[model samples]
Target: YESQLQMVQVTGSSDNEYFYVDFREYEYDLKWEFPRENLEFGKVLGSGAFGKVMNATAYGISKTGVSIQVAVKMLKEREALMSELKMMTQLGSHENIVNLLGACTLSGPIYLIFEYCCYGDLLNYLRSKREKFLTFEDLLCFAYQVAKGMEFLEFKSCVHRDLAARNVLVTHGKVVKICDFGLARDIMSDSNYVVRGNARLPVKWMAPESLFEGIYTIKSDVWSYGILLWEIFSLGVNPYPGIPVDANFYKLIQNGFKMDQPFYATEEIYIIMQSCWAFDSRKRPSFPNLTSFLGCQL
Candidate 1:
């Protein structure tokens, strides 16, 4: 009798917003392995540096009802687990940032729940549809959204060391959200005090100094943002097209390479990108300037 009542209760509330299962309840239920007939896994969205993401549906709730889709990130036990959760907790909430629905920390596994983005990352979206390159106006709007998210992160005194097109997710053709805080660091921490040599750096998108000395600052992020702007305008084409990573890093140090004139980039936008990659960190445009510059363009 109790089993039947439990089944009914789960099914009856599946359609309502209140039907959303709490993280604690989900954790408790995850203890016992359920039959394959109970829950169904949907399409595999994509994988990240640490885990695979999938779309899932919880069954046994309603006869013909389908629960809202959820993005599930399955992390391997070997990875540095706690730090990811700590970053998420530190990030808190922002409308421009991806929302963390809940998390499940089991004895052997960890699952992070997030609101599903139908369109997936910006890279995939650009690859699937390439007939139209994003216009400067379109790029401006998107870049503004990214800057807003960056501004929020800056306000929280957090540094997203890795910022690129692949880390930006989009949905509904308009909504842009930043993801993958794995490389993020608190601004106030001592760990960020030293400058490590750039061994595994994302060369094409990194600034000159950061590539050479690993000296990252808010200005370094601005340099990355400039590369991201080029990516958005180029519709995800590799930056510095033919230049190898090592050569690109050298050229950046020599101030020999600049973003080849993009077809869609206007004078203002071009200057903004240039300012971001300026050799002198002190001369780089501040985030406030970036915010205002984008605001005028918008």
Candidate 2:
């Protein structure tokens, strides 16, 4: 039986507690599976250690008669694809979070379909637009959308172990949507999210407890979201520009060292970011509180 950690709220109290939910109790159907004959693969958008993301055209997947463009996350590992699909289904659907369109797993390789975002990831989009113009309003809007989506996930008792700017997609209208659930490991080899034995972790964005005790909860996600805020306000600048990712770096975080405010971000915005990095994971503000705070900033 698969037991997953989840957060449950206390009755008539502001406290929340974690419990292990038996995932085996839930039965998931593959009703949204797409036939392989209708899929046409295009150029490769990107590739990681276990999968390749490609541009594809899905025939008759949408309600409209015409074919629709979709991003195909083609994976070599069947279990990982199945795991991600189940989590997406369990979370239901939300506007700010990326939803699965369909999966083609009966064939040789599994193909997970997602809506195509014209602008790609928020990190690259922000970097490319540096030559152009982006107002503070635009930055705050992106943060607010991400916070809203995270709030939804938190409400559903889901913890996004990997929440970073690169994991977020931007649509043609600049709508922000979070993606890549349960399959964020092994994206890089040497520098980023370094490998420890067989397990890989994004230490730069991880909470101290997560790094120290191998515990991942909603509170750890809040810490990553704070790092994400710094990433956004800095126009996708990586966190800890000068600090190296090592035992020393981890010790610094444990010692209460925090990233300075992004030059473009106001003092108020930085304060919100600092709140997320509270040493005590339980002391960090919940995503609901963050969404409300960000909405007020907008």
Candidate 3:
């Protein structure tokens, strides 16, 4: 398949056949993992408790002459690295989700190669775009793309525990690519996951059940998406501005308190956000329904 693509682009083949293989068609495993010898690493792009994301390139020209730049995440934990790599391998074909190039599992630290997003992560980009505001055009498109990605996760029975703007990336073309599956979990049931023992979580983005009872599920992710919508529509303001962090605040939220609608958010859009913040997770719409609702509003 590789040779066929190269031959077609270079016009160097005797038999003028075009054999095409989709990204999903490419079966992969640890055996197909890359080596670190020829990998040329550049400056670090970003870093956190997870590890470092660096700019790098290794592979040569494809069927085309273009040399693709990749974002390489150098992870310290083997278990986590493989968990992320496996999920990407299983669910990497969706266009709205970030695509995995390959992983290096040789004799050194784990290296994961992902298609680089020229525009960087969605959160920082949104904050810097208007210094505090995002155009409604980009915001709506961003919402649609993220909803599509979440729908795909639903299709695969993968629950994205964290679904904030910070977990999403934006291409130069402004496409939303969902990544950062460190907290994601696979559940037999489509609806809920009984949260395990004491696990520190992002309090502001957590759903009521997750924060109080330690229950995390796809519905909890949907609730986080609602908070993200608040972030988007308000341009880039931090959620719960001046809202104190204390036992009182947590109780207020449990009692059905939600932030006000963004000035830029239309009434219909605000309504959508409100529904996601439903006290009963069971009453909240699923990703499929959310996507269709967004489409109707658009």
Candidate 4:
């Protein structure tokens, strides 16, 4: 059978020649390639260093030939985009993880299609609805969903290096889907990244090793998961209310300072949060353990 795209090696530009072969047609095949014509671009959802997300409509994404709302992530660097796509495809689908619906990598800019969460990110949702919107049960449910998703990632040896409320999206059903695979890494590859690059780090949510030595592991992610829990229970309040993200903040953390329980978090949930912040990364609970624990809270 003839392929959808022919292979072409673009030479002479080392930096720009990342795509030696058309990834969508040959490597990924038609499974992830959404025809440009099938998409109708809409409003911009968000933007950051990596890329911008836009609310769009995808035609024929469903078997009924109906249009579905999608969040299209457009990236600046094809190389970075390829890495993200590779990670998502490797991780496969999960109910709690923001599953990659498809991508438009045939031409123009690369577009990563994802299920659109009508409620946007968890952080914003929590803030907007803080005026008595969510119940204690709802908070526990969100935490359980996140832990469940992280459990699947951990089981697959994938570490979500950055876990936070902002990285989680909420659908209309109150389902939480973990997003932002940009920092995800394979645990088999030592699962430790030394500080040797430039980027905006999630300082408050980061574990000590990740903050001090630039090391990242599943344990480090667990620490962030704890902070995310605090965020959920606290109704999206930033961690470490008094201290700013500066030298003093680092000093305080290094000296064994941990945030106190939030007003909304019950004693049990607070205990769970503290367990995630164990000074020794290895002492932190695994995602599976956290999942079971959080599941029981519901």
Which lDDT values do the candidates have, in the order given? 0.61, 0.78, 0.69, 0.74
- Model 2: how far residue 123 lies from native, Å: 1.0
RMSD of each: 13.2, 3.5, 12.2, 9.6
For model 4, how does the per-residue alpha-carbon lDDT over 1-298 read when each residue is reduced to its tens digit? 1111112233433312322233444245457787878989898787544457888899987556899998887764575566566556656788998777888887778877888888888988999988866788898999999999888876765665567787799998789998873322222232122232544466788889878776566677889999999999999988887667778878988988888999888899899899999988868998899988888878
User: Distance from true position, residue 17, model 2, in Å?
Assistant: 7.4
Which of the two, 2 or 4, has more TM-score? 2
Residue-level lDDT of model 3, residues 15-131, one tens digit each, is: 122222233333348744876765788777775444667888766422355567778877535554655566567664687877777788768888777777877777778878765
**Clashes per candidate (backbone, < 3 Å):** 1, 0, 0, 0
Q: Rank the candidates by TM-score, best first.
A: 2, 4, 3, 1
Range of the 10 consecutive residues with the lowest summed lDDT in candidate 1: 1-10
* Order of candidate numbers by lDDT, starting with the best: 2, 4, 3, 1
Question: Which residue pairs of candidate 3 clash?
Answer: none
Q: Pick the candidate with the highest lDDT.
A: 2
Supply the TM-score for candidate 1: 0.73
Error of 2 at 6 (Å): 9.5
TM values, all candidates: 0.73, 0.89, 0.80, 0.83
Clashing pairs in 1: 11-61
| Residue-level lDDT for 71 in candidate 2 | 85
